[PDB]
Design a protein around this ligand. Structure first.
Ligand SMILES: C[C@H]1CN(C(=O)Cn2cccn2)CCO1
Ligand SMILES: C[C@H]1CN(C(=O)Cn2cccn2)CCO1
Lengths: 304, 304
């Protein structure tokens, strides 16, 4: 029993983290096979960052200008290329700790683990969600860029995020490992405002299921609803619309608990309209939306 | 910016987790040097657990009855001993991945990371606190016993917890790595009720400091208080008494923010008496108490 905000074990990713230095900028790189992946803004002065022309800045950079340190040993850079907003530094040594891996681009509402690193060294691990506005709410200080987000699915480390930026509102923006930003964000120190940070409804419902499975049941009510009725209330509360695809995804949790998904929607509707009245669910005073239905099943079943 | 419930990177502990089987009970062991540490209840039938005599049950056990598997390779058990509520299984192979380590017994209010494991395989990592009633609020399914709690301090993995039990109220009890339970709990399937789960005041104050450092400042008020005045309100709200030792520990966060500790106490006092009024602090609708002052400094400074 018990339900925790749980990250994946980070060891497989720890073994991939290196330090990348260009001039006096140090940040983190990801070493898979004989490639090191890092934010292309490693090449920028903080002045460069106001309006960087990356292709022009890169002309001034040779392989020997990229210093890559794995622990306290230097890796030899034998090639570099820019792919979207990441650099790929080809090194002469394959990472001997390279796990089985994939690069995946996740959808808003999908969760992942972040291994926060500084100078290529792991400081901590936490669980994030890709917000509906394509920001994440991380914990990232200067030096943390190139820290990665990942899931460990089916004996494969799926890398989904690399840290690039903090917006003026202190939320975070980054890329997939092909260097494509999530959302409309750019690696430039300019006015970038995030859109509405809506609640990930399907994740809230998953977490209410987790709550019932762990004996937190006070919020279960005598009502049901329809997707259309529920969605009218969701819209009003800045919740994401629930689709039949979401209802299908919650099927296994519905089965396990015997609570129809639309009944749980009507319980969520009353929680929105009535509030928590000073009560908690799984030790939270607000409705948690950074657990996917897959996360709830995984944690409630003990997958390794 | 940003402040996350962050666990230590788990790789150093992942490399220590093994499977221990006695008859048809499988749980987790910790492999350091040539010793495997596991809950002594590995030897019990679920019937045994109602009133176990461990010394008597152990007479029936030989080295060859303890099956220890590290990945998919069997370790040879060449000795076993009971120390308090743990077994120490001496194996013929030193763990080649043994990190620098210490065994420490933590105090209530101290936080640590748990690597939840099943069949000796890591499933996830999360941050816990030793509650003032010497329980933890974990996430532990059948098979998770022998999962460990740890801190990584000063290039040393300090193991502080091994999972043994779930109480009927679904909170958790375990031992240090010398096999001594935290609190009054025993490894027997009997009525064990936890005491008052008080809020860890010094940790709440640390987290309010973290909130100010990360720009969440709405709760800062125009008042101060004294330890005695504050403690009268704390007592009423089931908060731990604040001591001058706690005030001293918060000194660096006071200095960094320029908010006197007693001013922050008076802000906390108003939050208790007035409530959150539907507002959040660092994305929480309740006052978080599972960050120590050391955790706030570490995360706000980027220690690796
Ligand atoms: C030779 C490498 C392989 N490693 C793995 O994690 C393999 N792996 C990935 C997913 C499942 N298993 C890390 C350390 O050394
Ligand atoms: C030979 C072992 C050593 N390991 C360490 O983590 C060492 N270490 C502990 C604290 C800081 N460093 C794990 C893998 O192989």
């Amino acid at each position: 029993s018990g339900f925790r905000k749980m990250a994946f074990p980070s060891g497989k990713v720890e073994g991939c983290m290196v330090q990348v230095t260009c001039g006096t900028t140090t940040l983190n790189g990801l070493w898979l096979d004989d490639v090191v992946y890092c934010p292309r803004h490693v090449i920028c002065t903080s002045e460069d960052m106001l309006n960087p022309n990356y292709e022009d800045l890169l002309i001034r950079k040779s392989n020997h200008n990229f210093l890559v340190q794995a622990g306290n040993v230097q890796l030899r850079v034998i090639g570099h290329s820019m792919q979207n907003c990441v650099l790929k530094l080809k090194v002469d040594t394959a990472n001997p700790k390279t796990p089985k891996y994939k690069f995946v681009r996740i959808q808003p509402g999908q969760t992942f683990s972040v291994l926060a690193c500084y100078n290529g060294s792991p400081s901590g691990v936490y669980q994030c969600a890709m917000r509906p506005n394509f920001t994440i709410k991380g914990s990232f200080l200067n030096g943390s860029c190139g820290s990665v987000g990942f899931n460990i699915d089916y004996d494969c480390v799926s890398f989904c995020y690399m840290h690039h930026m903090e917006l003026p509102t202190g939320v975070h923006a980054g890329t997939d490992l092909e260097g494509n930003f999530y959302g409309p964000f750019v690696d430039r120190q300019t006015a970038q405002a995030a859109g509405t940070d809506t609640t990930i409804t399907v994740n809230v419902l998953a977490w209410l299921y987790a709550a019932v499975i762990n004996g937190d049941r006070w919020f279960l009510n005598r009502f049901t609803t329809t997707l259309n009725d529920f969605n009218l209330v969701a819209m009003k509360y800045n919740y994401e619309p629930l689709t039949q695809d979401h209802v299908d995804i919650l099927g296994p949790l519905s089965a396990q608990t015997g609570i129809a998904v639309l009944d749980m929607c009507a319980s969520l509707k009353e929680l929105l309209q009535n509030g928590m009245n000073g009560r908690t669910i799984l030790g939270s005073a607000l409705l948690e939306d950074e657990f996917t239905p897959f996360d709830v099943v995984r944690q409630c079943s003990g997958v390794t």
